[PDB]
Amino acid sequence: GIALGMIETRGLVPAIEAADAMTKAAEVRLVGRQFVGGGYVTVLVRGETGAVNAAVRAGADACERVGDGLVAAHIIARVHSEVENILPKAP
Amino acid sequence: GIALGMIETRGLVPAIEAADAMTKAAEVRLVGRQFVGGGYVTVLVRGETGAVNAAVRAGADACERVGDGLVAAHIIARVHSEVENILPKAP
Amino acid sequence: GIALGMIETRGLVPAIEAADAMTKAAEVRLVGRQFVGGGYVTVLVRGETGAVNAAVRAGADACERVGDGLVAAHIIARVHSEVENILPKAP
Amino acid sequence: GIALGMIETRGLVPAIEAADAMTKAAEVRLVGRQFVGGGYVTVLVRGETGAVNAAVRAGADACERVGDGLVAAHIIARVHSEVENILPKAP
Amino acid sequence: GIALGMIETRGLVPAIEAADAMTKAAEVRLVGRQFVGGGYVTVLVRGETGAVNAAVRAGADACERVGDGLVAAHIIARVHSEVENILPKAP
Amino acid sequence: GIALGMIETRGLVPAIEAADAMTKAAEVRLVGRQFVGGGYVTVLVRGETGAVNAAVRAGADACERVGDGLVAAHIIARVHSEVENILPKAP
Numbered sequence: 001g002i003a004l005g006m007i008e009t010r011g012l013v014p015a016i017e018a019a020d021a022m023t024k025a026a027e028v029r030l031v032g033r034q035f036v037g038g039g040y041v042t043v044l045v046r047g048e049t050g051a052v053n054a055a056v057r058a059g060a061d062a063c064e065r066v067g068d069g070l071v072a073a074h075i076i077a078r079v080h081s082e083v084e085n086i087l088p089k090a091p
Numbered sequence: 092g093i094a095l096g097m098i099e100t101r102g103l104v105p106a107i108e109a110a111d112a113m114t115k116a117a118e119v120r121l122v123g124r125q126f127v128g129g130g131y132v133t134v135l136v137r138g139e140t141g142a143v144n145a146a147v148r149a150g151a152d153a154c155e156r157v158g159d160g161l162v163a164a165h166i167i168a169r170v171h172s173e174v175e176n177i178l179p180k181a182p
Numbered sequence: 183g184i185a186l187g188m189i190e191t192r193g194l195v196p197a198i199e200a201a202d203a204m205t206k207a208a209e210v211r212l213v214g215r216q217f218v219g220g221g222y223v224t225v226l227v228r229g230e231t232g233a234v235n236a237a238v239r240a241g242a243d244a245c246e247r248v249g250d251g252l253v254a255a256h257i258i259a260r261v262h263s264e265v266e267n268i269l270p271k272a273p
Numbered sequence: 274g275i276a277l278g279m280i281e282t283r284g285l286v287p288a289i290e291a292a293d294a295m296t297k298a299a300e301v302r303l304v305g306r307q308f309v310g311g312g313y314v315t316v317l318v319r320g321e322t323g324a325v326n327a328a329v330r331a332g333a334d335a336c337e338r339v340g341d342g343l344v345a346a347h348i349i350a351r352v353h354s355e356v357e358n359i360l361p362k363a364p
Numbered sequence: 365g366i367a368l369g370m371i372e373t374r375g376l377v378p379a380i381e382a383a384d385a386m387t388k389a390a391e392v393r394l395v396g397r398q399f400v401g402g403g404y405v406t407v408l409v410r411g412e413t414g415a416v417n418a419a420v421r422a423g424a425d426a427c428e429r430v431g432d433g434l435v436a437a438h439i440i441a442r443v444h445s446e447v448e449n450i451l452p453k454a455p
Numbered sequence: 456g457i458a459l460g461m462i463e464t465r466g467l468v469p470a471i472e473a474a475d476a477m478t479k480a481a482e483v484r485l486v487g488r489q490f491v492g493g494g495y496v497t498v499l500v501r502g503e504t505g506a507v508n509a510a511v512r513a514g515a516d517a518c519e520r521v522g523d524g525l526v527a528a529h530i531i532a533r534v535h536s537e538v539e540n541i542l543p544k545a546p
Contacts, residue, residue, distance in 0.1 A: 008104045008158055012216055012224040013190040013254040016265065023264035033268040034103055038130030038311070038402070039220030042103040043268075067190050067254030072104040072158030080114040083107065086124040086134075086182050091267045099286040099340050125285055129312030129494070130220070133285040163286040163340030173296035174289065176364045177306040177316075194398055194406040195372045195436040198447065205444040215450040221402030221493070225450075249372055249436030273450050281468045281522055307467055311402070311494030315467040345468040345522030353478040356471065359488040359498075359546050376489055376497040377463040377527040380538065387537035397541040403493030407541075431463050431527030455540045 001028075001048030003077040004087070005056040008042045010068035015041040018070075021062035026051035032088040040071060044087065049077045092139030094168040095178070096147040099133045101159035106132040109161075112153035117142035123179035131162060135178065140168045183230030185259040186269070187238040190224045192250035197223040200252075203244035208233035214270035222253060226269065231259045274301075274321030276350040277360070278329040281315045283341035288314040291343075294335035299324035305361040313344060317360065322350045365392075365412030367441040368451070369420040372406045374432035379405040382434075385426035390415035396452040404435060408451065413441045456503030458532040459542070460511040463497045465523035470496040473525075476517035481506035487543035495526060499542065504532045 005028065007018040012035075019030055028047035036042055045055055052075055060073035079087070096119060100106040110121055119138035127133055136146055143166055151164035170178070187210060191197040201212055210229035218224055227237055234257055242255035261269070278301065280291040285308075292303055301320035309315055318328055325348055333346035352360070369392065371382040376399075383394055392411035400406055409419055416439055424437035443451070460483060464470040474485055483502035491497055500510055507530055515528035534542070 004107075006104045006107065008102050011190050011222045011253055012218045013188050013256050016186075016188065016268070017256060017258065019265050019268065020258050020261050023262040028264075030264040030267060035219050036103045036130060036132065037126050037128050037219050039218065039222055040102045040130055041218065066256055071102055074104050074108060074157055076108065076111055079107075079111050082114040082119075082121040083110050085121060086107070086110065095289075097286050097289065099284050127285045127312065127314065128308050128310050131284045131312055162284055165286050165290060165339055167290065167293050170293050171296040173301075173303040174292050176303060177289070177292065193372050193404045193435055194400045195370045195438050198368075198370065198443075198450070199438060199440065201447050201450065202440055202443050205446040210446075212446040212449060217401050219401050221400060221404055223400065248438055277471075279468045279471065281466050309467045309494060309496065310490050310492050313466045313494055344466055347468050347472060347521055349472065349475055352471075352475050355478040355483075355485040356474050358485060359471070359474065375463050375495045375526055376491045377461050377529050380459075380461065380541070381529060381531065383538050383541065384531050384534050387535040392537075394537040394540060399492050401492050403491065403495055405491065430529055 003049045003052040004079055005045045005052040006074045007059045008040055008071040009063055010039050012041050014063040014066040014069060015043050017066050018059035018063040019043045022055035022059040025058035026054040028052055028055045030091055033091055094138060094140045094143040095170055096136040096143040096166055098150045098164050099131055099162040100154055101130055103132050105154040105157040106134050108157045109150040109154040110134045113146040113150035116149035117145040119143055119146045121182055123182045185229060185231045185234040186261055187227040187234040187257055189241045189255050190222055190253040191245055192221055194223050196245040196248040197225050199248045200241040200245040201225045204237040204241035207240035208236040210234055210237045212273055214273045276322045276325040277352055278318045278325040279347045280332045281313055281344040282336055283312050285314050287336040287339040287342060288316050290339050291332035291336040292316045295328035295332040298331035299327040301325055301328045303364055306364055367413045367416040368443055369409045369416040370438045371423045372404055372435040373427055374403050376405050378427040378430040378433060379407050381430050382423035382427040383407045386419035386423040389422035390418040392416055392419045394455055397455055458502060458504045458507040459534055460500040460507040460530055462514045462528050463495055463526040464518055465494055467496050469518040469521040470498050472521045473514040473518040474498045477510040477514035480513035481509040483507055483510045485546055487546045
């Protein structure tokens with residue numbers, strides 16, 4: 001599956017719980033954890049459409065109350081192939 | 092084409108949704124995704140003048156409500172040769 | 183043990199006092215100290231479930247009044263295998 | 274010419290338009306684009322005194338309305354030779 | 365001596381005066397100067413307990429009025445050996 | 456001489472104008488320009504005690520109205536040998 005799920009948080013601790021809740025929620029693979037600058041952290045997962053939708057909803061609910069909380073939660077079920085050049089394949 | 096499109100966001104998730112909307116909207120290549128410092132991210136595209144105009148406006152409309160949102164959307168249809176030395180050629 | 187403890191602070195001094203209180207409070211190993219960006223720091227410990235619970239609560243109580251203070255204190259007693267790829271094994 | 278022109282902005286997008294407006298305004302060479310930290314970006318040009326004065330005035334006017342806008346615009350027509358050791362020669 | 369002293373400041377200038385006041389105040393060795401992110405800077409010294417206590421008190425008083433001032437001032441007279449893996453030995 | 460002068464600013468443009476005013480004001484060498492994190496920049500000079508005093512006060516008066524301005528201006532006429540290990544010798 002090539003659908004993409006993304007959760008952005010303030011700090012690394014909410015991000016690490018988001019990643020746990022996502023990967024326990026459905027069959028998805030964790031491809032990236034990016035320190036964006038100025039406090040933001042983003043975790044990326046790939047999998048099938050049904051799986052990525054459940055994973056992102058679970059991560060969003062689990063990290064909102066942790067540390068400085070949630071920034072963004074977002075799905076793109078089929079990115080353009082051009083966007084693959086800025087998406088990591090391994091953490 | 093050598094027209095330049097650029098979109099700056101707060102955080103990485105609005106920038107990836109910006110990159111996706113831009114490349115599906117017209118024939119543009121993604122030449123870079125830059126971590127600016129302090130939370131800003133900038134995505135950059137190249138192509139013919141009309142393609143880049145259609146691309147930039149679609150990415151702005153798409154990322155506006157994603158995460159912490161949109162900072163800038165802007166076009167330079169023919170940069171001076173000088174500026175090419177600070178523009179990346181692939182991301 | 184493979185339970186995970188995490189404490190996020192504003193600045194490096196509250197995080198080192200957090201690491202000290204955590205490791206003296208129960209049998210946990212210090213696997214990482216991460217400079218997150220924008221001032222956040224995160225310290226991470228591993229061990230059995232009860233050791234990590236006692237560790238995390240002691241570090242929170244210790245760093246709360248140090249410097250700019252505590253951001254998050256949180257435990258994941260069995261992370262998914264997926265998340266292991268973004269957790270450091272030594273600092 | 275060895276006079277120096279400098280424009281500092283919030284974000285990379287206003288900086289890239291500043292560089293375009295400067296180099297289209299008079300004969301100057303673009304020597305640097307620096308990510309300062311915490312959002313600031315600085316572009317540096319060199320050339321003759323008359324040229325650097327026109328270039329900086331044009332860049333300042335062109336970038337004020339772009340993204341998060343302008344921070345500083347400044348000329349030094351002849352830096353001390355000691356200052357050359359912190360001025361880049363190539364972008 | 366293995367006791368640890370720590371001073372965190374906003375900016376590098378208050379940190380450099382803190383380090384001067386600490387090392388002139390008692391026999392301590394300067395082991396680290398860390399750029400934490402988002403403006404914070406931390407200086408670390410080691411020595412005996414009596415020496416580290418005088419050093420930190422002097423540094424704290426000397427840097428409060430310099431630049432953007434003091435963030436934290438803190439002693440741990442005997443860190444756990446696990447914490448040694450995140451403490452530098454040389455600046 | 457081994458007296459130390461230091462000026463901290465918000466952004467890179469006020470710091471370069473600070474470096475220029477300092478080196479033209481008396482016989483001082485520029486030993487470093489440090490990107491601190493979060494937007495702060497620090498420039499550092501060495502020389503005899505009177506040269507460094509004249510240098511520092513001139514740089515403060517010059518950069519005050521440039522960009523986001525001046526954070527600190529400060530002199531240490533004889534640092535302890537300990538601190539030399541965190542001071543750069545050339546920029």
